[PDB]
Each structure stands twice: as structure tokens, then as C-alpha cells.
Swiss-Prot record, chains A, B:
Belongs to the phi29likevirus scaffolding protein family. This is Capsid assembly scaffolding protein. It comes from Bacillus phage phi29 (Bacteriophage phi-29). Scaffolding protein involved in the icosahedric procapsid assembly. Coassembles with the capsid proteins to form the procapsid. The scaffolding protein is found within the capsid as a serie of concentric shells. During DNA packaging, the scaffolding protein molecules are released from the procapsid. Homodimer. Interacts non-specifically with DNA; probably binds DNA in the early stages of DNA packaging.
Length: 81, 81
């Protein structure tokens, strides 16, 4: 996945020096470019699963509300019979 | 919040030019460094709440089974009477 913070800092270090070869400047920039995209995507992956799980919670809260209702209904239908 | 992809790209565009003023180069590398930390932190914020919610899922399943069991024992003593 995405670069570790020390790997990213390393690239930023190479880029500090103007004396750096052009094939290596563009190569380091491309690593940053591609890495940024990777990071956005990984954040999307987690967002997607977070969305799924918050929907499970909500749907289960409603399902448990329905069962709590039927349990109070059957608790009242016990004094009668 | 972390830089948008187009703002990040823009910084990479500036840094491609070897003639760029050293004052602006270090300012640009700074923005990248700081932004990288901000992004790790945003991802951490989301990981934290995701963890919390996955524990809410488990606790919702447990409450469900705790209601479905009491729903069984009440339905069963509707046969006794």
C-alpha cells in the first residue's frame, strides 16, 4: 500500500537538492503522485466498509426495536391468560 | 483536511522545475510533509470510529440474541396456559 512516513520523507529529502538528476527528479515526483492516489483509494476502501457497517448497526437497531415491541406485547398478553 | 488531488499535483508541478526558487521549494516540500501527516491522522480518525462501530455491531447481535431468547421463553409459556 501507501508509503510509510519515513519512505515519504526520504523522497522529500532527495527533492531538496537542486543538483539531482532529471530522470530521478521526475521519478521521485511520480512516486509521490502515484502514492497520493493510492492513499485516497485506501481511504475510500475503509470508507466503503465503514458505510456498510454503520448500515448494519442501523438495520439491526430497527430489528431489535421490533423484537422489543413483540416482547412487551407478549408481556401484556400474560396477565390476560 | 488533506490536500485535494489537484492541489497535491500542483505542488508536484512546481517541484518539477529545477530552476525553482529554493525559498519556494522548501515551502512546497513542507506542504507535502505536513500534508502526509494530516492524511495519516485522518485515516486514523476513520479507523478509530470504524473500530467503535464494529464493537457496536457485535453488541447489537448480542442484544438481538438476548431478545430472541426472551421471545422464545414467552412464546413457550403461552402453550403452558
Amino acid at each position: 500500500g501507501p508509503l510509510k512516513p519515513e519512505e515519504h520523507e526520504d523522497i522529500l529529502n532527495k527533492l531538496l537538492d537542486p543538483e539531482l538528476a532529471q530522470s530521478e527528479r521526475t521519478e521521485a515526483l511520480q512516486q509521490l503522485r502515484v502514492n497520493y492516489g493510492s492513499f485516497v483509494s485506501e481511504y475510500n476502501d475503509l470508507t466503503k466498509d465503514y458505510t456498510r457497517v454503520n448500515d448494519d448497526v442501523a438495520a439491526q437497531q430497527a430489528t431489535n426495536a421490533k423484537l422489543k415491541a413483540r416482547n412487551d406485547q407478549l408481556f401484556a398478553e400474560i396477565d390476560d391468560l
